[PDB]
Structure formats: C-alpha cells, structure tokens
Amino acid sequence: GKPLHEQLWYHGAIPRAEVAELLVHSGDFLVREGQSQPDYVLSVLWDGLPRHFIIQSLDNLYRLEGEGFPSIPLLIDHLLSTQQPLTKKSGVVLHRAVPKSR
C-alpha cells in the first residue's frame, strides 16, 4: 500500500503545540512522529483537548489495545470503518483525517 509517510494524515515531526492548532472537532485525527519519544503517535481531538495514543510496534504488527495490523494505514482505516473506540477506557473514535499543512 501507500507508505505511511505519504498518507495525507501523516504529519511527521510536528510538536504537540501544532497538533492543538490543527485539530478542531472531536474525532479529528492525525498521525505524527513522536516528539519526546521515538514511536508514532495517533493524536485525536476529544471534547476540545488532544489525546495522544502511542502506536505500539511489535512482531511486524502495529496496535493500540486490540488487533495487530501489518501497517499503520490499515489500523487507521479499520478504526475509521468500524468506529470502534481506540481504547475502552477512552471512548475516543476516529471520524476524520486532518491533512498535513504542507
């Protein structure tokens, strides 16, 4: 598939301050490079505040707390198509993909 870094919703090395400027409505999301740590982050606006979920990488899979996917785009598209919460604890759901400012 199309590599992660070419996805319209992959923003690379943007800091948290920029995430808060780019996400506007609940369920707006982007994926970015880690800032204080090296793993990818799925950042999602929920009730006015960004929530930051580290995407775990292991055994050739990517996951949050559920299924393992062979790529991050597949994880994202699954979350969007099922509308399942990213975690049971959070209740956060993806609704729409925020494009990279560039």
């Binding site: 982050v41 775990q56 990213l86």
Partner: peptide, 6 residues
C-alpha cells in the same frame, strides 16, 4: 508529556 494508557 502525558499519553493515553494503552
């Protein structure tokens, strides 16, 4: 920085 418990 705070991250979601996952």
């Amino acid at each position: 920085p705070v991250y979601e418990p996952v």
